[PDB]
Amino acid sequence: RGSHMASMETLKSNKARLEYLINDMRRERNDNDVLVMPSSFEDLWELYRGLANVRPALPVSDEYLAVQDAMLSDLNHQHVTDLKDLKPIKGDNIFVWQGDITTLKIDAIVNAANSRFLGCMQANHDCIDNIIHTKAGVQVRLDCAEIIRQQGRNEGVGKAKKTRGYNLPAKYIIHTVGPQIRRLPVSKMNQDLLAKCYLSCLKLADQHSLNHVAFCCISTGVFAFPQDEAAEIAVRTVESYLKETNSTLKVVFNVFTDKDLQLYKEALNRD
Ligand SMILES: [Zn+2]
């Protein structure tokens, strides 16, 4: 695998970087008991990730960031997808793309954050918030913490805040908190709030003169907005915004599942 593609030196170096990062985070927690450091890249990664996910938003040394950034940049740029190589599915300005949002070269990706705004603090959890934070680096959690400290309160639903993307190929991450759905059918208030997430993100991207923005599937997963309904709100809000403002923004709907992928194509077909 690695030999023909010349990957072996980088694998051995990335493993050494993970062990350094793991050791530093364990020392900080006063986990002084000597753990069995796994041999594999995969098992090292899941150990590192769990430790990063749970770490409170406390200062980090420049030495730690040097190692973390070398490792994260190498991993995120290995199989990068550039927006310039994709083609619009609608007009010249709307794309649908199945893939990992943390590997897309684009001005901004949109994070489905929570109101505490530090990322996902559940070890090794499969949500978008966790994945974005983990691949981007600890600097995102620290920047988020500073945003919350300066505003004196948790983040409300339907807003947008921008941070740098750090180790991601994305220049920026736009963080929005989507509505939590408990009861069905979805209230008009909650439908309006999900729309507001998209609008807020679009407005902020145009406010900063960005050329492109990729959305994930906001309020799906644990917030558990019904899928078909969310897709419909996403598409309708985007197309309305682009039409009414004559924005030059290019908008990517990032999906992972084939179910979502079909939902998005169907929504963009129906007029
Ligand atoms: Zn999570």
Numbering used by the authors: -6 to 264
Provide text from the study.
In some pathogenic microbes, the response to oxidative stress is controlled by a SirTM/zinc-containing macrodomain (Zn-Macro) pair responsible for establishment and removal of the modification, respectively. Strikingly, however, the “catalytic loop” found in all other MacroD-type enzymes (also termed “loop 1”) is replaced with and extended loop containing the zinc-coordinating Cx(4)HxC motif, here termed the Zn-loop.
His118 (SauMacro) coordinates the Zn2+ ion via the sterically more demanding, but tighter coordinating, Nδ1 nitrogen. The diphosphate-binding loop supports ligand binding and can transition between an open and closed confirmation. However, our data do not support this binding mode: first, the different orientation of the diphosphate-binding loop in our apo structures shortens the cavity, which would sterically hinder the binding of the dithiolane moiety. Deletion of the N-terminal 3α-bundle (ΔN, aa 1–70) leads also to the loss of zinc-coordination, which is consistent with our structural observation that the Zn-loop is partially stabilized by the 3α-bundle.
